[PDB]
């Protein structure tokens, strides 16, 4: 999809039960390139499992997603990757003990073109993603050394280099400092204005609306509702099931 | 009159001092937050408080005596309660059975084990007074959230506790839960029960508290009524940053 175009990530009809036990019933959104969406509502009511059977990590028992218009329902995470669909899983335990730049270089040291890289564009190509994420100070850090802030920032640019169309963050504000919240949202207006289309799940609703496009409500396995921010703080239903009289 | 004295706690693993100084203080009917940076010390001077951590340094005293030393059961016998988030009540036990076995282990003032009858007085008050009474034979496993967690309260009074201390009780619940938690410790305010609240949700726990303790590289930063944290220079810089608002 060329560099301008809107991508579109569509999800129909999401249904998974473990012992039935059904925790998804019918799960439908849409996600485009650039627009940010929340999936919001109770704790287990569906919207972590709807979440994660859109990574990839948790199996469908019926529905559809496409990419594209190319079916993705029954690929893992990892191929879902190589199409442009990019989860960000908050963890320092992968860079181990490399430098940001090293940690950076090992994630273009495995793509194609459609051959390998060069050592020399490998290196381009690490510089400029330092110096888009403005963390260039960084390159010689061990990552024990990097806060919470600089470690998603490492994590969007190793994500940045397979070029995503669309970045799947989990609850990226849980247990964080306010002061952290603004480094959030600015990641977040970041990819935004990269055509990057973002999905975020979050207890935090307050701080995810905030940042959101549109947003959907997802209670009793269901979509509650979905909307702008200020219509889904309108909303009767959503008020009386999840948010509260006086929100 | 009760008072629950922390002085210099202090905890070291190895080469990490996770918590180098920390003193606060409780008095009944009072509701004191225990707020920080994540990992900076609050939660391992929380533990120290409840007694899942030994102290290295130190002191805490509840009402006049030391309790340093002394594990959670004697602790509680002594009316400090540790209330968990969704981890205190018995699975499979009913509402009643639930409250009344805490009971069961309640004296009377000259130290004789309650009767029959007192435990039975007692569970329908302690019921009433949370409104859960018409919830009495339905098994802990089929409650809601809300109802679940005025079972723990429940269990808890039975205690005649002069302090409960609440870990993360607003991790992760909506905002329909925030303000029932909020009332609930009202409620315990009312009661005369101090409440000592560790969690990450900073603008729910200032918003019922009367005063908070701030804990940055392991030692207090600040200490205030909520409005006096807020305007605090230092609390600004290092937690809230710029934009927090209550
Ligand atoms: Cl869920
Ligand atoms: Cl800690």
């Known amino acids: 999809q060329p560099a301008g175009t809107t991508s579109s990530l569509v999800v129909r009809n999401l249904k998974k039960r473990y012992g039935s036990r059904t925790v998804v019933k019918d799960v439908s959104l849409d996600v485009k390139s650039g627009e940010v969406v929340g999936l919001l509502g109770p704790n287990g009511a569906g919207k972590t499992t709807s979440f994660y059977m859109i990574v990839g990590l948790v199996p ?19 191929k ?40 020399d564009a490998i290196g381009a190509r690490t510089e400029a993603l330092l110096e888009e994420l403005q963390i260039a100070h960084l390159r010689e850090n061990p990552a024990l050394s990097l806060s919470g802030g600089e470690r998603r920032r490492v994590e969007i640019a190793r994500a940045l280099a397979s070029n995503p169309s669309f970045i799947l963050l989990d609850e990226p504000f849980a247990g964080v400092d306010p002061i952290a919240v603004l480094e959030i949202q600015k990641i977040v207006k970041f990819l935004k204005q990269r055509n990057i289309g973002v999905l975020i799940t979050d207890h935090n609703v307050r701080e995810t609306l905030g940042i959101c496009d549109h947003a959907y409500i997802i209670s009793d396995g269901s979509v509650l509702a979905s909307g702008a921010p200020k219509e889904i703080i309108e909303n009767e239903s959503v008020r009386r099931v999840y948010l509260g009289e006086h929100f």
């Open 80 to 119: 879902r990757a190589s199409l442009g669909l990019s989860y960000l899983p908050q963890e320092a335990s992968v860079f181990r003990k490399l430098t940001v730049e090293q940690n950076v270089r090992a994630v273009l040291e495995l793509q194609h073109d459609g051959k390998r890289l060069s050592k």
């Open 60 to 78: 469908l028992d019926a529905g559809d997603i496409s990419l594209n218009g190319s079916p993705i329902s029954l690929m893992p995470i990892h």
